[PDB]
Amino acid sequence: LNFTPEDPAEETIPADELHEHLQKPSTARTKRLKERCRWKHASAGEFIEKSVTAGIERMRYLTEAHKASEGKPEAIRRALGLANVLNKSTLVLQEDEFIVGYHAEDPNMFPLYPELSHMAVQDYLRSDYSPQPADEAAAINEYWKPHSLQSKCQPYFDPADLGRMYQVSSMEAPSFASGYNSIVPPYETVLEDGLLARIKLAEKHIAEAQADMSTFPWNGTKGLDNIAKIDNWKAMVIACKAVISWARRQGRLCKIVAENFETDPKRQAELLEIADICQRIPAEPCKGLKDAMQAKFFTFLICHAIERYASGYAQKEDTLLWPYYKASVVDKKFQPMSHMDAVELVEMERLKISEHGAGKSRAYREIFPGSNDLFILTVGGTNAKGEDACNDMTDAILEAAKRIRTAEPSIVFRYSKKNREKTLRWVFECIRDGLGYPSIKHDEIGTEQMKEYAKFSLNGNGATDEEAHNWVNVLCMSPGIHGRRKTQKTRSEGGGSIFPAKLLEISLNDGYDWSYADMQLGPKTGDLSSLKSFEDVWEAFRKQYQYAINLCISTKDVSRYFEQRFLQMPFVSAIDDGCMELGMDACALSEQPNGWHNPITTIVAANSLVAIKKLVFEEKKYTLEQLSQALKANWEGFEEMRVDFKRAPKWGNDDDYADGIITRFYEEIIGGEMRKITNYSGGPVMPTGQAVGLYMEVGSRTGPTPDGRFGGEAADDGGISPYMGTDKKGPTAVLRSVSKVQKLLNQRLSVPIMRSKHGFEIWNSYIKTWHDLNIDHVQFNVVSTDEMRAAQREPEKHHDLIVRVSGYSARFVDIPTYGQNTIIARQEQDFSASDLEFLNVEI
């Protein structure tokens, strides 16, 4: 009944600086490593650390190799490109590091990608972070321009349509234009088999293919199939051999420094251990946890930075590292460790990620203020038999997060009722410390979505019912298979956003966006006078949505077409059992379909339509001309009219008239018309109820809407979360509203009840109810307003304060004042006795 802090030490600690006393690094080493951490996060279009700038070695060595590889098969050229980069790159070794490696010539730098988007590199050339020398980089960007993925996709689209997508108002810009990307790396293959084994497999396949081509009698209708296979397998060998050499040259650096530079005998012996690890790994199979963690990081560098840029950190880390945690900690067969040693190791991993400079474009640094890049790993969930997957490696991951307190990487916890309590308590510890993560995903919901997509497999080799349990978050919102095979290899497969709120706004202006772009954003579906009935505004929005979603998916498939032809990824292909077996490129082979796309600001356009039908066509209180006049005036006049449109029946009020329209709006237009589209993998394109921080930007990109919003008033709280200051029936009612959609939840909990000894039981009771209501996602914010206000006044005393923005976490002081005030304004929800009965609690 009493909400005293579980730790008596917090009784004396001022509430406006609580989170400045929560961090507790497992060792002195990780304490030093956090203090001297080379942060790469940025704010207001500017990096927080002063030394952060772009490198040029990748651009240089990729260009050199490309010129020299003319005439050769593109797959091999790409392998030779990666090889040249790895062979000639300056390697980096820092002090106190155990997990070593980097993706640039300088630890403060980040590589660029002229082979992707010409515009993206151009923007860095015109910035304070341009690669040096600036003239050489400019020459490199000009050389790559006709070979860029952007230049290959553009001719097959009306330049007028592309301009509409480049506005980023109704449609997100295509990935070939931005260079943005995601991937789920087959880490399991590297750790289990090693790269030498993959080379031997490829070499054997080549000899078999060559033997077939010289086999009498020849068949020209079949024999020529070996050409693409041999080219792919040869590229895999080149790529793998380069990574091994690159990892061993990294180890040689450790040996050199330990023998010629390092003065501390403790560090010297440590660097020699790291040298032995880099020597064997990833050439040989991993035998211990230290090997596994190093392999995983090496593999991460190649797949997400060196071979190609790919935002994300998708992996099932606990399940992935468990066999090596077991060999090291549990059985102590190789590299004997304690549980705390594992905790320190994960701490060091989080720091390496915190130092990972992302060569992403500027446009994708604005949508996520105060962050480096979106790094989201997944833990928990269930195994193949539906049994609990949680283990001590899971706990080690979670404890390290709580201890080191870094905003990145974020964590997704797949919640099942099978999940043991001991792990759940660790989940709660991170949340109660206001980290914003682990966010909670519905285990069964995601598993079923893997089974559904598996049916559309072109080669009939989708994920089995057992393999469906092996899923992770690709980025912030969407599920995806992990493992040695059938993993998503590109953002072209799944990802991207569409904004129905913008589609509706232009639907009342003949496809013309007057508020933001000041141009024709959609097709001329008709003027206000042509629209004589509510059925016409329903078809006006339909054609706007159809036209928009068609461009969104077509641009990704066209990108996919040229990605497998000119942007081959022979390394990723080498560590995929499917690609290695069939001799195909990672982008070419797509065994497990996963075509998602994100409808953001859907509820905003949904509520607006209800107010239109009733006030304009049913009651005839206002004509479409007056409403359009009221919008274009940004509610300067028509104040009694504005409050009347907000008064109109909304979503989440159990209103038959309102809910009856939204239901028909989601299953027929938003989800119906979208399901009609088939992507590259032969599967349907299904919606994702979520908002990846776009709402803050898009909300400023969308005009005033008949839901009561002014011009630029941003936004929807989440992808399905209720509008700010609209939920007036408690936190339990928010659970009632989201659960209605069956064909992302942001919540703020009170600090005192969470820092108490009764905190876990209340939180767990909420989660169990949340799971029973079949809600897909939920994240929690545990931070007092006073501490945020104190962080605004004296930022230099609140560096370790971490808050949850959207789909990611960030340091509150590294967020612009405009962004801070937006997060603060949100009301902290409390639980009543009626709510507790609904959650079926038991104290």
Binding site for other proteins (CB under 8 A): 36-38, 51, 87-88, 90-96, 105-108, 241, 244-245, 248-249, 252-253, 256-257, 260-261
* 38 touches, from a copy of itself, Cl ion, other proteins, none (C-beta below 5 to 8 Å by class): other proteins
* 214 touches, from a copy of itself, Cl ion, other proteins, none (C-beta below 5 to 8 Å by class): a copy of itself
Can you give 725-761 as a three-state secondary structure string? CCCCCCHHHHHHHHCCCCCCCEEECCHHHHCCCCHHH
Shortest Å distance, C-beta 298 to other proteins: 15
Tell me the residue length of the chain: 843
Of positions 105, 341, 644, 673, contacts a copy of itself by CB under 8 A: 673
* 253 touches, from Cl ion, a copy of itself, other proteins, none (C-beta below 5 to 8 Å by class): other proteins
* 406 touches, from a copy of itself, other proteins, Cl ion, none (C-beta below 5 to 8 Å by class): none
The closest alpha carbon to 413, from 423, 421, 404, belongs to: 423
Residue 623 CA neighbour count, 13 Å, CB half: 8
Residue type, 79: A
Q: Which of residues 682-701 bind a copy of itself (CB under 8 A)?
A: 682
Does position 147 interact with a copy of itself (CB under 8 A)? The reply is yes
When the beta carbons of 410 and 515 are compared against Cl ion, the nearer one is: 410
Shortest Å distance, C-beta 542 to a copy of itself: 10
Does position 550 interact with a copy of itself (CB under 8 A)? The reply is yes
DSSP 6-55: SSGGGGTS-GGGGGGS----SSHHHHHHHHT-----EETTEESSTT-EE-
* 261 touches, from a copy of itself, Cl ion, other proteins, none (C-beta below 5 to 8 Å by class): other proteins
The alpha carbon of 563 is separated from its chain's Cα centroid by a whole number of angstroms, namely 20
Cα separation of 307 and 246, whole Å? 13
Cα separation of 833 and 785, whole Å? 24
Shortest Å distance, C-beta 828 to a copy of itself: 45
Which are the contacts of 203, defined by CB distance < 8 A and separation ≥ 6? 233, 237
When the beta carbons of 240 and 587 are compared against other proteins, the nearer one is: 240
Cα separation of 396 and 391, whole Å? 9
Shortest Å distance, C-beta 49 to other proteins: 8
The answer to whether 507 is annotated as binding is no
Cα separation of 436 and 620, whole Å? 46
Residue type, 615: L
Residue whose tokens read 């917090």: 10
Does position 455 interact with a copy of itself (CB under 8 A)? The reply is no
When the beta carbons of 455 and 676 are compared against a copy of itself, the nearer one is: 676
Does position 475 interact with Cl ion (CB under 5 A)? The reply is yes
Does position 72 interact with a copy of itself (CB under 8 A)? The reply is yes
Give the number of residues in contact with a copy of itself, rule: CB under 8 A: 44
Cα separation of 713 and 724, whole Å? 11
The answer to whether 250 is annotated as binding is no
Residue type, 728: K
The answer to whether 491 is annotated as binding is yes
Q: β-pairing, 777-781 with 746-748?
A: parallel
Does position 560 interact with a copy of itself (CB under 8 A)? The reply is yes
Does position 214 interact with a copy of itself (CB under 8 A)? The reply is yes
Q: Which helix (H) or strand (E) holds 358?
A: none
When the beta carbons of 102 and 124 are compared against other proteins, the nearer one is: 102
Does position 230 interact with a copy of itself (CB under 8 A)? The reply is yes
Can you give 417-433 as a three-state secondary structure string? CCCCHHHHHHHHHHHHC
Cα separation of 339 and 539, whole Å? 61
Does position 8 interact with a copy of itself (CB under 8 A)? The reply is no
The stretch among 248-256, 285-293, 387-395, 674-682 that binds a copy of itself (CB under 8 A) is 674-682
Shortest Å distance, C-beta 489 to a copy of itself: 15
The answer to whether 664 is annotated as binding is no
The closest alpha carbon to 324, from 294, 350, 354, 358, belongs to: 294
The stretch among 292-300, 307-315, 446-454, 542-550 that binds a copy of itself (CB under 8 A) is 542-550
Does position 623 interact with a copy of itself (CB under 8 A)? The reply is no
Give the number of residues in contact with Cl ion, rule: CB under 5 A: 4
Shortest Å distance, C-beta 116 to a copy of itself: 14
Shortest Å distance, C-beta 32 to other proteins: 8
* 475 touches, from other proteins, Cl ion, a copy of itself, none (C-beta below 5 to 8 Å by class): Cl ion
Shortest Å distance, C-beta 557 to a copy of itself: 4
Query: Hey, is 110 helix, strand or coil?
Result: strand
Query: Hey, is 675 helix, strand or coil?
Result: helix
User: Phi and psi dihedrals of 94, rounded to 5?
Assistant: -110, 165
- Two tokens at 807? 């789909």
Q: Sign of the CA dihedral 686, 689, 690, 696?
A: positive
Are the C-beta atoms of 85 and 92 separated by less than 8 Å? Answer: no
Of positions 23, 151, 628, 700, contacts a copy of itself by CB under 8 A: 151
* 230 touches, from a copy of itself, Cl ion, other proteins, none (C-beta below 5 to 8 Å by class): a copy of itself
Q: Which of residues 478-537 bind Cl ion (CB under 5 A)?
A: 478
The answer to whether 459 is annotated as binding is no
Does position 477 interact with Cl ion (CB under 5 A)? The reply is yes
The answer to whether 151 is annotated as binding is no
Shortest Å distance, C-beta 678 to a copy of itself: 5
Cα separation of 137 and 701, whole Å? 33
Are the C-beta atoms of 202 and 233 separated by less than 8 Å? Answer: yes
Strand order across the 686-687 sheet: 497-498, 596-599, 686-687
The closest alpha carbon to 361, from 523, 148, 118, belongs to: 118
- Two tokens at 160? 């007028």
* 477 touches, from Cl ion, a copy of itself, other proteins, none (C-beta below 5 to 8 Å by class): Cl ion
Does position 557 interact with a copy of itself (CB under 8 A)? The reply is yes
Shortest Å distance, C-beta 680 to a copy of itself: 4
- Two tokens at 251? 């180890």
Shortest Å distance, C-beta 159 to a copy of itself: 12
Of positions 245, 629, 663, 678, contacts a copy of itself by CB under 8 A: 678
The closest alpha carbon to 36, from 105, 108, 101, 92, belongs to: 108
Query: Hey, is 802 helix, strand or coil?
Result: strand
Shortest Å distance, C-beta 258 to other proteins: 10
When the beta carbons of 38 and 811 are compared against other proteins, the nearer one is: 38
Q: Sign of the CA dihedral 606, 611, 614, 616?
A: negative
* 460 touches, from other proteins, a copy of itself, Cl ion, none (C-beta below 5 to 8 Å by class): none
The answer to whether 496 is annotated as binding is yes
Cα separation of 807 and 325, whole Å? 29
Q: Which residues of this protein are in contact with a copy of itself, per CB under 8 A?
A: 70-72, 145-148, 151-152, 156, 158, 161, 210, 213-214, 216-221, 223-224, 226-227, 230, 458, 546-547, 550, 553-554, 557-558, 560-561, 673, 676-682
Binding-site residues for fumarate: 475, 477-478, 491, 496, 598, 690
Binding-site residues: 475, 477-478, 491, 496, 598, 690
Q: Which residues of this protein are in contact with Cl ion, per CB under 5 A?
A: 474-475, 477-478
